[PDB]
Scaffold this active site. Structure first.
Site, PDB file in Angstrom:
ATOM      1  N   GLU A  35       0.798  -1.322  -0.088  1.00  0.00           N
ATOM      2  CA  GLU A  35      -0.088  -0.097   0.130  1.00  0.00           C
ATOM      3  C   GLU A  35       0.822   1.196   0.036  1.00  0.00           C
ATOM      4  OE1 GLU A  35      -3.190   0.628  -0.173  1.00  0.00           O
ATOM      5  OE2 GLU A  35      -4.082  -1.499  -0.219  1.00  0.00           O
ATOM      6  N   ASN A  46      -7.731   9.630  -5.397  1.00  0.00           N
ATOM      7  CA  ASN A  46      -8.646   8.745  -6.201  1.00  0.00           C
ATOM      8  C   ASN A  46      -9.327   9.477  -7.076  1.00  0.00           C
ATOM      9  OD1 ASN A  46      -7.702   6.412  -4.637  1.00  0.00           O
ATOM     10  ND2 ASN A  46      -8.927   7.057  -3.063  1.00  0.00           N
ATOM     11  N   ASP A  48     -12.566   9.825  -7.604  1.00  0.00           N
ATOM     12  CA  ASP A  48     -13.838  10.169  -6.859  1.00  0.00           C
ATOM     13  C   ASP A  48     -13.501  11.333  -6.042  1.00  0.00           C
ATOM     14  OD1 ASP A  48     -12.623   9.142  -4.437  1.00  0.00           O
ATOM     15  OD2 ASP A  48     -14.342   8.050  -4.075  1.00  0.00           O
ATOM     16  N   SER A  50     -11.533  11.599  -3.441  1.00  0.00           N
ATOM     17  CA  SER A  50     -10.990  11.438  -2.100  1.00  0.00           C
ATOM     18  C   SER A  50      -9.485  10.998  -2.225  1.00  0.00           C
ATOM     19  CB  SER A  50     -11.762  10.084  -1.566  1.00  0.00           C
ATOM     20  OG  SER A  50     -11.474   8.908  -2.292  1.00  0.00           O
ATOM     21  N   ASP A  52      -6.112   8.669  -0.174  1.00  0.00           N
ATOM     22  CA  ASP A  52      -5.673   7.934   0.696  1.00  0.00           C
ATOM     23  C   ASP A  52      -4.386   8.292   1.552  1.00  0.00           C
ATOM     24  OD1 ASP A  52      -7.865   6.095  -0.490  1.00  0.00           O
ATOM     25  OD2 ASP A  52      -6.249   5.144  -1.737  1.00  0.00           O
ATOM     26  N   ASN A  59      -8.880   5.797   3.551  1.00  0.00           N
ATOM     27  CA  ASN A  59      -9.365   6.524   2.617  1.00  0.00           C
ATOM     28  C   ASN A  59     -10.420   7.695   3.183  1.00  0.00           C
ATOM     29  OD1 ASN A  59     -12.238   6.858   0.848  1.00  0.00           O
ATOM     30  ND2 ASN A  59     -10.360   6.828  -0.431  1.00  0.00           N
ATOM     31  N   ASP A 101     -15.360  -4.054  10.334  1.00  0.00           N
ATOM     32  CA  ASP A 101     -16.835  -3.462   9.813  1.00  0.00           C
ATOM     33  C   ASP A 101     -17.157  -4.558   9.012  1.00  0.00           C
ATOM     34  OD1 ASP A 101     -15.432  -3.271   7.370  1.00  0.00           O
ATOM     35  OD2 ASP A 101     -16.060  -1.503   7.040  1.00  0.00           O
TER      36      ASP A 101
END
Ligand SMILES: [Cl-]
Ligand SMILES: [Cl-]
EC number: 3.2.1.17
Length: 129
Positions: A35, A46, A48, A50, A52, A59, A101
């Site tokens: 990563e 990213n 969209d 957003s 990281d 994110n 989650d």
């Protein structure tokens, strides 16, 4: 800070992560490698809008506030810049909520594509743990 492999393993093994939610320590070190290349300061934008952040590329649409992702949720209740610290505590504590989650480590695309189903134990081999 750019961690060494065993250095990060030990810090992760000092903050809750060996076998957290059933994921051995080699999974977490593998995910960090692909990563962020072990760099706490890594950022990636990213499509969209957003971003990281940090050693585990957490994110900003869901987990932290960077003040420029409209409609985001800040579920870890932190500014994203705290995820870039040399002290990995904030990153580890947010990762614990993410993996809990429901979707486990599949939240991390590089883990899904480059660690899952490999010999992840090789990532802590030779380390004094
Ligand atoms: Cl392991
Ligand atoms: Cl799971």
């Amino acid at each position: 800070k750019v961690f060494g492999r065993c250095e990060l393993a030990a810090a992760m093994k000092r903050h809750g992560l060996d076998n957290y939610r059933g994921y051995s320590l080699g999974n977490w070190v593998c995910a960090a490698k692909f990563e962020s290349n072990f760099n706490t300061q890594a950022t990636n934008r990213n499509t969209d809008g957003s971003t990281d952040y940090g050693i585990l590329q957490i994110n900003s649409r869901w987990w932290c506030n960077d003040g420029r992702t409209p409609g985001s949720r800040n579920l870890c209740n932190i500014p994203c810049s705290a995820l870039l610290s040399s002290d990995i505590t904030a990153s580890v504590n947010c990762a614990k909520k993410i993996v809990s989650d429901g979707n486990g480590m599949n939240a991390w695309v590089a883990w899904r594509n480059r660690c899952k189903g490999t010999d992840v134990q090789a990532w802590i081999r030779g380390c004094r743990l």
